[PDB]
Design an enzyme around this catalytic site. Sequence first.
Site, PDB file in Angstrom:
ATOM      1  N   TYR A 176      -4.285   2.731   9.835  1.00  0.00           N
ATOM      2  CA  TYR A 176      -4.281   1.479   9.424  1.00  0.00           C
ATOM      3  C   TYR A 176      -3.896   0.631  10.422  1.00  0.00           C
ATOM      4  O   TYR A 176      -4.191  -0.573  10.424  1.00  0.00           O
ATOM      5  CB  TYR A 176      -3.907   1.187   7.845  1.00  0.00           C
ATOM      6  CG  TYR A 176      -4.625   1.776   6.710  1.00  0.00           C
ATOM      7  CD1 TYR A 176      -5.779   1.267   6.519  1.00  0.00           C
ATOM      8  CD2 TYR A 176      -4.193   2.722   5.949  1.00  0.00           C
ATOM      9  CE1 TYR A 176      -6.614   1.791   5.291  1.00  0.00           C
ATOM     10  CE2 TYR A 176      -4.598   3.267   4.758  1.00  0.00           C
ATOM     11  CZ  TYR A 176      -6.055   2.781   4.636  1.00  0.00           C
ATOM     12  OH  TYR A 176      -6.804   3.205   3.481  1.00  0.00           O
ATOM     13  N   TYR A 236     -10.515  -9.835  13.675  1.00  0.00           N
ATOM     14  CA  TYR A 236     -10.025 -10.536  12.511  1.00  0.00           C
ATOM     15  C   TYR A 236     -10.365 -11.886  12.719  1.00  0.00           C
ATOM     16  O   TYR A 236     -10.770 -12.605  11.673  1.00  0.00           O
ATOM     17  CB  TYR A 236      -8.677 -10.281  12.033  1.00  0.00           C
ATOM     18  CG  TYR A 236      -8.680  -8.588  11.449  1.00  0.00           C
ATOM     19  CD1 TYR A 236      -9.499  -8.271  10.407  1.00  0.00           C
ATOM     20  CD2 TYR A 236      -7.925  -7.466  12.334  1.00  0.00           C
ATOM     21  CE1 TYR A 236      -9.416  -6.750  10.067  1.00  0.00           C
ATOM     22  CE2 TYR A 236      -8.116  -6.188  12.032  1.00  0.00           C
ATOM     23  CZ  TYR A 236      -8.804  -5.788  10.851  1.00  0.00           C
ATOM     24  OH  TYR A 236      -8.698  -4.555  10.312  1.00  0.00           O
ATOM     25  N   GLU A 274     -14.732  -4.215   5.540  1.00  0.00           N
ATOM     26  CA  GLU A 274     -14.855  -3.347   6.912  1.00  0.00           C
ATOM     27  C   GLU A 274     -14.985  -1.830   6.633  1.00  0.00           C
ATOM     28  O   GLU A 274     -13.948  -0.982   7.207  1.00  0.00           O
ATOM     29  CB  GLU A 274     -13.404  -3.953   7.598  1.00  0.00           C
ATOM     30  CG  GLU A 274     -12.242  -3.549   6.992  1.00  0.00           C
ATOM     31  CD  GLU A 274     -10.787  -3.816   7.944  1.00  0.00           C
ATOM     32  OE1 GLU A 274      -9.951  -3.959   7.230  1.00  0.00           O
ATOM     33  OE2 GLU A 274     -11.011  -3.891   9.000  1.00  0.00           O
ATOM     34  N   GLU A 323     -19.709   6.025   7.391  1.00  0.00           N
ATOM     35  CA  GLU A 323     -18.785   5.995   6.609  1.00  0.00           C
ATOM     36  C   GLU A 323     -19.131   5.484   5.049  1.00  0.00           C
ATOM     37  O   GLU A 323     -18.160   5.573   4.033  1.00  0.00           O
ATOM     38  CB  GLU A 323     -17.404   5.075   6.606  1.00  0.00           C
ATOM     39  CG  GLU A 323     -16.732   5.379   7.845  1.00  0.00           C
ATOM     40  CD  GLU A 323     -15.636   4.382   8.483  1.00  0.00           C
ATOM     41  OE1 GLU A 323     -15.262   3.562   7.542  1.00  0.00           O
ATOM     42  OE2 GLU A 323     -15.020   4.756   9.459  1.00  0.00           O
TER      43      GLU A 323
HETATM   44  C1  LIG Z   1      -9.766  -0.805   5.757  1.00  0.00           C
HETATM   45  S1  LIG Z   1     -10.724   0.727   6.156  1.00  0.00           S
HETATM   46  C2  LIG Z   1     -11.934   0.494   4.944  1.00  0.00           C
HETATM   47  C3  LIG Z   1     -11.339   0.842   3.483  1.00  0.00           C
HETATM   48  O1  LIG Z   1     -12.045   1.070   2.238  1.00  0.00           O
HETATM   49  C4  LIG Z   1     -11.527   1.867   1.560  1.00  0.00           C
HETATM   50  N1  LIG Z   1     -12.614   2.374   0.747  1.00  0.00           N
HETATM   51  C5  LIG Z   1     -13.473   3.234   1.221  1.00  0.00           C
HETATM   52  N2  LIG Z   1     -14.366   3.388   0.339  1.00  0.00           N
HETATM   53  C6  LIG Z   1     -13.917   2.750  -1.079  1.00  0.00           C
HETATM   54  C7  LIG Z   1     -14.471   2.590  -2.137  1.00  0.00           C
HETATM   55  N3  LIG Z   1     -15.828   3.173  -2.636  1.00  0.00           N
HETATM   56  N4  LIG Z   1     -13.873   1.862  -3.073  1.00  0.00           N
HETATM   57  C8  LIG Z   1     -12.798   1.307  -2.807  1.00  0.00           C
HETATM   58  N5  LIG Z   1     -12.225   1.346  -1.574  1.00  0.00           N
HETATM   59  C9  LIG Z   1     -12.565   2.153  -0.753  1.00  0.00           C
HETATM   60  C10 LIG Z   1     -10.732   3.093   2.313  1.00  0.00           C
HETATM   61  O2  LIG Z   1      -9.684   3.686   1.861  1.00  0.00           O
HETATM   62  C11 LIG Z   1     -10.321   1.944   3.423  1.00  0.00           C
HETATM   63  O3  LIG Z   1      -8.808   1.806   3.308  1.00  0.00           O
END
Ligand SMILES: CSC[C@H]1O[C@@H](n2cnc3c(N)ncnc32)[C@H](O)[C@@H]1O
EC number: 2.1.1.320
Lengths: 310, 625
Positions: B312, B322, B423, B432
């Site tokens: 992070y 940002y 993001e 992702e």
């Molecule tokens: C800041 S990088 C993207 C962030 O989204 C979170 N994330 C990814 N998919 C989900 C989801 N379905 N619900 C909540 N948070 C998510 C990840 O844990 C990560 O911290």
Amino acid sequence: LPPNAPACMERQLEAARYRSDGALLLGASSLSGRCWAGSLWLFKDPCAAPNEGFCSAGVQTEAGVADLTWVGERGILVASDSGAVELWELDENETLIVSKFCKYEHDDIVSTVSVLSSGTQAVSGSKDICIKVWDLAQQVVLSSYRAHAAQVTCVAASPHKDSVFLSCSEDNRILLWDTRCPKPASQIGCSAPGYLPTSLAWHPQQSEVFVFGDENGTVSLVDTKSTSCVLSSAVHSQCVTGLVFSPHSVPFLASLSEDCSLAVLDSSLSELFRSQAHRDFVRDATWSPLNHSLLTTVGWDHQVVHHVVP
Amino acid sequence: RVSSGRDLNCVPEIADTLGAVAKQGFDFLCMPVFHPRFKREFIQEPAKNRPGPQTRSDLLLSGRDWNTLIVGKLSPWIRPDSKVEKIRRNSEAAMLQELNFGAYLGLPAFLLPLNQEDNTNLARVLTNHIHTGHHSSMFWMRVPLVAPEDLRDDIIENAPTTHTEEYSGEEKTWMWWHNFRTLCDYSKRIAVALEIGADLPSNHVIDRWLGEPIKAAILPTSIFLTNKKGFPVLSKMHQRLIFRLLKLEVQFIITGTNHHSEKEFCSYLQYLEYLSQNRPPPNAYELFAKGYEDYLQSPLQPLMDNLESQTYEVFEKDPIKYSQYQQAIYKCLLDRVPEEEKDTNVQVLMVLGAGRGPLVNASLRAAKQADRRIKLYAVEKNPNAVVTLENWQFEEWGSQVTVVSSDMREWVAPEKADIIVSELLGSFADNELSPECLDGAQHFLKDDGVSIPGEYTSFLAPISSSKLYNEVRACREKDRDPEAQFEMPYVVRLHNFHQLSAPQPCFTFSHPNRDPMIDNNRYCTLEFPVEVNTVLHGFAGYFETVLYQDITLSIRPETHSPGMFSWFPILFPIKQPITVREGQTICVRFWRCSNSKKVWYEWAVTAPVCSAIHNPTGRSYTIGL
Ligand SMILES: CSC[C@H]1O[C@@H](n2cnc3c(N)ncnc32)[C@H](O)[C@@H]1O
């Protein structure tokens, strides 16, 4: 042993050239052990060679001697591992040998040298693939030719023509050169491409005739005029390193090979004599000016052999 | 700065010679381990019984010197591909002998020429040496840009130089390299020492070498010019090439005699260092990306996995990125709330995957910038990151921010949202599963709600890199398919490579997705016109996203967001390299495939030749839902 003469000769005997008076020029390299260098030796009594303490004159070269030639009666022109062509001058008393010039022009080992008919010019060949024309008097390169596409094995100046010389290379080309021509080189040889050319000798009498030896032990007789391969004999079981003509009115041809043998051939390229004398590679041959029946061979076995030719 | 060595074919005393070259400033010496003229006989008496020693002693240097300061050279009489049987046999034996001595000495590298087209037996013997005990030492294949036959002076009356230009003919020395390394099965120990000539070839001929493993460049003294003060220097073209080679961090080797006599070889070397220190300096991205060049990494799966604290931290270390987010939300607030409703209107802003809160902070800076009113939800499934969030909201954000510890697909929102911000993008955008995540959350977006980002598009381009093909190949692991390495993408700072064609859009997603029936599956066919001879090894992936209107992020080179080091490119390998001829089109096919459990990519090249379909049913690579 004389003054400026090394108290020990390097084992690998590279060159043997009888001057007019029957005096012996020796070139040797150290091809193994700690020190890779070379030596120049003069033996006014040739039967004393190779023993250092019976020598007329000797000197140490910075590097090994790939090739050697007499320049007249007092001059020695050297093809060095250093990429240098070296001119060595005899003493007035001929007691010592002293560096006239050492020129670093070739980017790799200088493999081959020949003095042109003037005695004022020479041609060098190198593993750097270039052939250079040298002004001996002014100690400079008149011309540098990249005609070839691999390392240059041999260069032999025409007996009587200062602008004409042969070259052969692992690019499988034999070149006939005439510096008077704007494109100075001309690719000559048999009609059929064959084995790599290793050795060159002009006929001393017939200025348009030469012999070459190959990597496969074959010796071949060529006419510039016919531009066709006259006669070929399989004389050796390994490459022909050297080809030397007798001083006789009808010359004899001495053949030397990595097969560690000497062969003497007639004009028809037939075999008269053969010597298994050397037990390593046979590097050079010179006929005595004094007795033309005598042929002196040197080899990497450090043997100086004196042959009696029928 | 510059690592350089001296190439010599004459070493009277190894101690004196080494001292000399050190004094001149050379890091190492290339030299013969046997005397270059000392031809040896192995089969025929009497020459085979030649009394030794066969060369100079290992005792003449320290193990450290042998290990670090010496590169060996094959003797030039050694011709394993000679048409003369005896020379072939002797050259086979001598080549083994010289290589075995190099291994004996612990030399870090050994130089072997590719000086002709047929090096088959030379390859067979080298392969044998390599497969005789696992060792690390490198083999530098000395290959010219321009073959010596094509360099020769036009001075043969009856054999004129073919002045008529040949595209493929001028690339013949690349084909020498290619055939040798293919025969030797892409040994990682076999690299290129590229020998540069006075006459640089055409650009296409130089471009042939782009993705190849060049460890060294050999510069003959011959190719150097003379300045007014008589210093050795180079043509601007030679210099542009040097600058190119400095980016590949190759070692330079000076060969030949000192043609600038009233100077020393530090002159040649000082010129190089001069060029090196005087090189066009690298951008901050290149400084950010300095350690990661061609480093293969697994794509992060922040859905399936809970990212670590330091992951992070790196995400957060991109202020440009940002600023773009702040600007997109800034703009969107002004669009949604007229200055008349400024104080009466409070917009519900939801950050979906809020990590440690950088988008929350940007959202807050944006709202104060816009001078408009916002209510923030911060949704984050990673409970470790929720620790960071809840400490932030207690200490700083206060009740303006409601932290939600939930999957955005499962969460029952207390109210619908004006704006969702996220993001959730990897290097191939949707890798992702941003689509599936945002699709799950879109029921709790207002009918007129905005998603930031509104859109993202993946891009692909075919690449050549024998380096990266070999690094992938080296990723075999026990207890899995021996070719699984090739059926998965890698995130990588693509460095030693050739892009064969302009990037083309692959897959596109839009948020919200108003589709009555929504299918995030995809099948795409791409045609890359290729204007060079080359070898395909894989596909570089990139992405662009529209945050809002004109505010974007891109890692696509042509449109790269300047100074944004947040994402390196992705690489889709193929199992077998594919030859492509100038004029030919590369046709690749990509699928985005899915279950309830997993999403994955499959791919096949269908032109100029068919590959296998890579990653059928996600057997080698899946992305967890
Ligand atoms: C800041 S990088 C993207 C962030 O989204 C979170 N994330 C990814 N998919 C989900 C989801 N379905 N619900 C909540 N948070 C998510 C990840 O844990 C990560 O911290």
